[PDB]
């Protein structure tokens, strides 16, 4: 119904959108709607870790501890059921009673004295529990321990631990995040076998074969590493032949398929172009993998023999394809000693295919000798059953392979090959595929952009064209972004230094030397006191003179659109009056190689111009078309993918065929500067600038610059419409241009009358779709998350507000020194700790770098004080470690709002309460602790529930607040609200702390759409359960 162009500005934390109505010639005539959507970037803002790292670490730790506990339990079961254990020694849900507390001394004394049955289970359990290692410090420690074992009398690792290991540093097991006291699992096998042999030598009715077998199984039990999905590891069927099972990713034909598929689309990149392998190149690279294993990026290059002019679609060194099955079979044959080191494998492809199928379908010796006995020689079966194991299944059957492989060898492409042998448009964009987008931030940004596009298409209709502009910070890693920020800061500092240098030459220049004269003077400095084109010299009178020097483009704008920083040069008063839209190749007689060209080349050859600008002195018949096309578009992965996806997967009611225009960055700044347009609302400004850069505006701009390039104006730059810089500013900020002290209009009536008053000459400034901009934020209504803080505290003194926590000395400060649990029971220790602390002015790292010693009464010393347990306040917490520890509460996940007597009460709900299913009943009361909180009963009406980032509104007796709820303080009962656009002039950094919810006249939570429209109140019906 409405013809319009939709402009998008996509960042890593926001997406601005605008719609510009166009005529039949793609010319802006109106500004219909605009808006901004804000979210949180899909990464940790503090460091840059992915959003799913803590979850992965916690899952790994959980699995590790579960496996260790299960292994110890199985060891106990084996020691009870398969030997002498006297199962009256095992009581309740408990363990071996009266277990000795010194396995380490026992394990080193089992070769000179019999061990009691009560002293055998201890050493066995200790060996199973700490079973050693199977990344530099750990390897160095185990290597040093191995070297130490084979030097002195250290027949057992336990003897090493007892003799030289503990008497030096006073400990046996490692402390802190260090790596010295680690052992290898092979050494533990050696010690275990020595223990069993030399202890059966002395006696003991134990040490049967079952004990040895069980302990050796438990000691060398490690789960095999998982890889890939689980559906891929199953025997399915064929997509083309529904009568034969799949094939393994080990057979000759399947790996031939993989190799041909990878080789066909190599796409050797010649200086940025598309240079595929021809028939003669693919006839040689085909057989290289099958002959050598590590075929890397450069390994093919030597066969290609190029001269750095052909890249690939050092650091670029990765195996493009590897022979897994072939070299695995070759090694299995070689290690038995029945094949030379380097020779072709004397086996038909059918034989390797059949052994691969058998090895991937059956995993027992009997079955593998049940299917390979009649096909391979007697030695081959045994040689294969010693170093060979295969897995995984491809989705292509064996029968179809015999047809697919020959065609791909003939050069036919995959798709046409399988077609000969054997993406429709929609209204809304489909979900962004995560296969190609291997980045979380980019995926989240594109998902939000797709949501905005779907919403606007739903509200208005199919857009004619989409103009995408992405900030330079998108599609980049965190380190590159930080480098960009530091480079920008350094550039700003250098600009300030250059400005300070400028303020010396001509103080009389007005009262504010700006950056334009700075650029003029800097470019003058580049010429090194010389002039260009004209050939005259420096010592001109006044640097500005209003006409003496004019910044001009060397290559004309009308043909290049290449402002950049290289093209612009500064000339003198003479010359340049009859240049025109001529490149220097057609103006200085360079085509005929005259003096007018060589002289100026010599003059500029001593300049300080950059390499790109220095080699842009001359352009030998450059492409006068693609160049202006290259500066008007974007050549990055994200922009190209967006263009392709929105071009194919949805409908755009345009006119041409390339109805997606990804614009550049410099062109946007040029347009915004030319047209007048100079908080978190400026995103829509670039959106409007971007959606008005149609090809018709480009045509008019080219005509204007070409006319003005000849000095033929014997008028300002063309604009989309008259009064452009005013209407856009009024629509965005609701205030007149450049007036941060003016009042803001946040209502339809106020904005409409402001538009009618300040733009009475434009009848199109008002329409039925004008609404003050409202920034929208991404909701977060997850009820999952952390259960409590990592640290846990003793809960013995929990009747009061007390909790004991052991802190190291190096971390303790003077603030917690006055809260030590034992403050009055040892006076001298506290005084010494204060004296050490009150020396370096609360510097614990530099004060406790020396050992601490509890000095005995009347002198002498005693044992170290490495850590001290201090006392902290604790009014509430979470019971963990099986009612043995108390932990701090987790992040707030829900608030329940109740109303009674024109008063509002907040009931906090945490994650652990959701997990246990115990919904709370106590509303927060300021001052009093939880035990004195107002209990909730049937007399309290329930209004709604608040999650983080939810639209709320309060009406207090002083003013009215409308914002996004962020956090609720349980100590006061006051909620915090962020202003919609996060204005720095309202509150502290856009937030309104300490809002008084209680005694408020009105309080209700609002609902907002994804485009910032449809702001309506919501009345929740009944309290939802936690689970």
């Amino acid at each position: 119904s409405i013809n319009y162009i939709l402009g998008l500005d996509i960042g890593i934390a926001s997406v601005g959108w605008a719609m510009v109505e166009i005529d039949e010639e793609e010319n802006p005539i109106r500004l219909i709607d605009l808006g901004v959507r804000v979210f949180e970037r899909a990464e940790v803002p503090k460091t840059g870790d992915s959003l799913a790292m803590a979850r992965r670490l916690a899952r790994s730790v959980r699995r590790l501890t579960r496996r260790r506990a299960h292994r110890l339990l199985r060891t106990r079961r084996l020691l009870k059921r398969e030997g002498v254990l006297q199962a009256a020694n095992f009581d309740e849900n408990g363990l071996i009673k009266s277990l000795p507390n010194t396995p380490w001394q026992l394990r080193a004394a089992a070769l000179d004295r019999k061990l009691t049955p009560l002293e055998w289970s201890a050493v066995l359990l200790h060996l199973i529990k700490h079973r050693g290692y199977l990344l530099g410090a750990l390897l160095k420690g185990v290597a040093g321990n191995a070297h130490a074992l084979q030097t002195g009398d250290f027949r057992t690792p336990a003897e090493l631990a007892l003799n030289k290991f503990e008497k030096e540093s006073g400990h046996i097991r490692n402390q802190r995040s260090d790596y010295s006291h680690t052992f290898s699992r092979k050494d533990l096998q050696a010690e275990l076998i020595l223990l069993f042999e030399k202890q059966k030598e002395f006696g003991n009715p134990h040490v049967s074969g079952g004990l040895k077998e069980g302990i050796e199984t438990l000691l060398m039990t490690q789960r095999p590493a998982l890889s890939g999905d689980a559906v891929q590891k199953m025997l399915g069927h064929c997509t083309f032949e529904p009568a034969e099972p799949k094939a393994a990713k080990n057979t000759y034909t399947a790996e031939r398929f993989i190799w041909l598929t990878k080789l066909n689309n190599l796409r050797i990149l010649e200086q940025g172009s598309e240079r595929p392998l021809t028939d003669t190149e693919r006839a040689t690279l085909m057989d290289e993998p099958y002959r050598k294993s590590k075929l890397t990026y450069a390994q093919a290059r030597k066969l290609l023999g190029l001269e750095d002019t052909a890249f690939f679609k050092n650091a670029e060194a990765s195996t493009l394809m590897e022979m897994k099955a072939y070299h695995a079979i070759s090694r299995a044959l070689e290690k038995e000693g029945l094949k030379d080191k380097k020779s072709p494998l004397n086996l038909s492809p059918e034989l390797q295919d059949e052994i691969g199928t058998a090895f991937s379908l059956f995993k027992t010796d009997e079955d593998i000798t049940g299917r390979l006995k009649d096909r391979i020689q007697p030695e081959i079966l045994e040689a294969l059953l010693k170093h060979i194991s295969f897995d995984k299944f491809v989705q292509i059957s064996l029968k179809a392979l015999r047809r697919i492989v020959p065609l791909m060898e003939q050069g036919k492409r995959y798709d046409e090959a399988c077609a000969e042998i054997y993406t429709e448009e929609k209204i809304y964009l489909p979900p962004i595929p995560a296969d190609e987008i291997r980045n979380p931030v980019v995926l989240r940004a594109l998902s939000q952009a797709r949501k905005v596009i779907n919403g606007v298409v739903r509200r208005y209709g199919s857009p004619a064209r989409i103009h995408i502009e992405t900030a330079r910070e998108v599609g980049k890693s965190f380190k590159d972004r930080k480098e960009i920020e530091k480079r920008q800061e350094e550039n700003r500092k250098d600009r300030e230094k250059a400005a300070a240098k400028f303020r010396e030459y001509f103080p009389n220049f007005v009262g504010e030397p700006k950056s334009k004269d700075i650029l003029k003077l800097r470019l003058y400095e580049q010429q090194h006191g010389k002039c260009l084109y004209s050939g005259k010299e420096i010592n001109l009178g006044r640097l500005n003179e209003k006409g003496y020097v004019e910044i001009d483009h060397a290559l004309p704008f009308s043909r290049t659109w290449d402002d950049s920083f290289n093209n612009k040069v500064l000339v003198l008063g003479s010359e340049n009056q009859n240049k025109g839209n001529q490149t220097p190749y057609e103006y200085f007689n360079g085509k005929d190689n005259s003096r007018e060209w060589q002289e100026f080349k010599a003059r500029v050859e001593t300049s300080r111009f950059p390499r790109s600008k220095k080699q842009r002195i001359l352009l030998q018949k450059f492409d006068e078309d693609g160049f202006k096309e290259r500066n008007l578009n974007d050549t990055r992965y994200v922009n190209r993918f967006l263009c392709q996806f929105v071009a194919d997967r949805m409908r755009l009611t345009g006119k041409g065929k390339k109805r997606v225009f990804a614009s550049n960055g410099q062109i946007t700044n040029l347009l915004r500067g030319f047209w007048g347009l100079r908080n978190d609302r400026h995103h829509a400004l670039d959106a409007v600038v971007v959606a008005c850069s149609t090809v018709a505006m480009q045509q008019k701009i080219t005509r204007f610059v070409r006319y003005k390039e000849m000095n033929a104006f014997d008028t300002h730059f063309p604009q989309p419409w008259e009064f452009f810089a005013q209407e856009v500013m009024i629509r965005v900020f609701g205030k007149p241009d450049g007036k941060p002290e003016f009042e803001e209009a946040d209502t339809l009536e106020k904005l409409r009358t402001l538009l009618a008053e300040k733009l009475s000459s434009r009848p199109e400034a008002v329409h039925e779709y004008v609404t003050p901009l409202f920034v929208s934020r991404a909701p977060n209504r997850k009820m999952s998350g952390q259960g409590h803080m990592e640290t846990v505290k003793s809960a013995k003194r929990l009747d009061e507000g007390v909790s004991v926590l052991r802190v190291p000395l190096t971390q303790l400060k003077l603030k917690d020194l006055e809260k030590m649990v034992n403050r009055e029971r040892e006076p001298k220790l506290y005084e010494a700790l204060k004296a050490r602390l009150e020396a370096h002015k609360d510097d614990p790292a530099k004060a406790f770098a020396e050992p601490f010693y509890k000095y005995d009464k009347a002198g002498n010393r005693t044992q170290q004080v490495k850590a001290v347990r201090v006392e902290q306040v604790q009014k509430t917490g979470v019971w963990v470690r099986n009612h043995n520890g108390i932990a701090d509460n987790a992040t707030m996940v829900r608030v329940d709002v109740f109303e009674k007597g024109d008063k509002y009460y907040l009931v906090p709900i945490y994650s652990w309460q959701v997990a246990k299913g115990i919904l709370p009943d106590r509303a927060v009361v300021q001052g009093k602790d939880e035990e004195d909180w107002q209990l909730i009963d049937d007399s309290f009406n329930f209004k709604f529930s608040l999650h983080p980032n939810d639209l709320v509104e309060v009406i207090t007796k002083k003013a009215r607040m409308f914002g996004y709820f962020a956090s609720c303080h349980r100590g006061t009962g006051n909620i915090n609200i962020r202003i919609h656009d996060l204005d720095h002039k309202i509150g502290k950094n856009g937030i309104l702390e300490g809002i008084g919810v209680k005694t408020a006249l009105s309080f209700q939570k609002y609902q907002i759409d994804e485009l910032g429209k449809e702001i309506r109140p919501c009345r929740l019906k009944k309290r939802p359960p936690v689970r």
Binding site: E216, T217, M220, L226, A230, K233, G236, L385, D391
Partner: protein, 87 residues
């Protein structure tokens, strides 16, 4: 319906694993987990020969134990699925 270490892969198929999507979550999760664990264990029940530290009899001892564990796991999974009433 019996599961044996010889005819095992003919039953542990993608079709059999995907037939479980109809069951309610309280039943769907455990049998699917059992099937996945058994399939992975069978698929990785021979890397003990690829590692040179599991020398001599330990290698096929681990292989036999892993195969028995996998076949018992899928026997339990298929018994639970049979109780839930699928074919």
């Amino acid at each position: 319906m019996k599961i044996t270490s010889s005819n095992f892969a003919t039953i542990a198929t993608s079709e059999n694993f995907a037939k479980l999507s109809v069951l309610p979550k309280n039943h769907r999760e455990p049998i699917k987990g059992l099937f996945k664990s058994a399939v992975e264990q069978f698929s990785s029940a021979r890397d003990f020969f690829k590692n040179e530290n599991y020398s001599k009899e330990l290698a096929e001892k681990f292989n036999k134990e892993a195969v028995n564990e996998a076949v018992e796991k899928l026997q339990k999974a298929i018994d639970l699925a049979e109780k839930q009433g699928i074919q």
